[PDB]
Curated annotation (Swiss-Prot):
Organism: Homo sapiens (Human)
Topology relative to the membrane: Lipid-anchor
Outcome of mutating residue 112 to P: Abolished delipidation by ATG4 family proteins
The keyword Lipoprotein appears for this protein: yes
Record note on what altering residue 22 to K does: Increased interaction with WDFY3/ALFY, no effect on SQSTM1-binding
Lineage: superkingdom: Eukaryota
Family per record: Belongs to the ATG8 family.
Effect seen on changing residue 48 to A: Decreases C18 ceramide binding
Keyword Transmembrane helix: no
Protein name: Microtubule-associated protein 1 light chain 3 beta
PTM annotation, UniProt: The precursor molecule is cleaved by ATG4 (ATG4A, ATG4B, ATG4C or ATG4D) to expose the glycine at the C-terminus and form the cytosolic form, LC3-I. The processed form is then activated by APG7L/ATG7, transferred to ATG3 and conjugated to phosphatidylethanolamine (PE) phospholipid to form the membrane-bound form, LC3-II. During non-canonical autophagy, the processed form is conjugated to phosphatidylserine (PS) phospholipid. ATG4 proteins also mediate the delipidation of PE-conjugated forms.
Effect of residue 23 to Y: Increased interaction with WDFY3/ALFY, no effect on SQSTM1-binding
Length: 115
C-alpha cells in the first residue's frame, strides 16, 4: 500500500538520482495520508517535485490547495515521522537534515495532531 512497500530501496534510490539529473533544483517529496485518516481526502499522486526555495508554510498552502480544503478543515503535516519544528525553514534546509536514506523527503498528513 505505502510508497516504501510499492518500490524496492534500489528503485527509490535510482528515482531520486534521476530527479537530481533532470530536475536538479527540485526537492523529491513523498506525501501520504495517515492510514487512520477519516476526514481528509487522498491526493491524486504520491511523488512531488518541490522548488527548493519554498518554505514549509508555503508547502502546507500548496497541499491545502491540491486537496481543495476550505478555511476551517484542520491539516497537520509530519516530516520524517515527526512534527515540523518550524514552517519558516526553506525546504532545501529541511531536506539536508530530514531526508530518508533513500534520498526522498517523507511527509504524512492528518486532520488530528494525534497521528
Ligand atoms: C549519488 C548520485 N546522485 S545523482 C546520480 N546519478 C545522476 C545517477 C547515477 N546512478 O549515476 C548519482 C550517482 N551515482
Ligand atoms: Cl530543475
Amino acid at each position: 500500500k505505502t510508497f516504501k512497500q510499492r518500490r524496492t530501496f534500489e528503485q527509490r534510490v535510482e528515482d531520486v538520482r534521476l530527479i537530481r539529473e533532470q530536475h536538479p533544483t527540485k526537492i523529491p517529496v513523498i506525501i501520504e495520508r495517515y492510514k487512520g485518516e477519516k476526514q481528509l481526502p487522498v491526493l491524486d499522486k504520491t511523488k512531488f517535485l518541490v522548488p527548493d526555495h519554498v518554505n514549509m508554510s508555503e508547502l502546507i498552502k500548496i497541499i491545502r490547495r491540491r486537496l481543495q480544503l476550505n478555511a476551517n478543515q484542520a491539516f497537520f503535516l509530519l516530516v520524517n515521522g515527526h512534527s515540523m519544528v518550524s514552517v519558516s525553514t526553506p525546504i532545501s534546509e529541511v531536506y539536508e537534515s530530514e531526508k530518508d536514506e533513500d534520498g526522498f523527503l517523507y511527509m504524512v498528513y492528518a486532520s488530528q495532531e494525534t497521528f
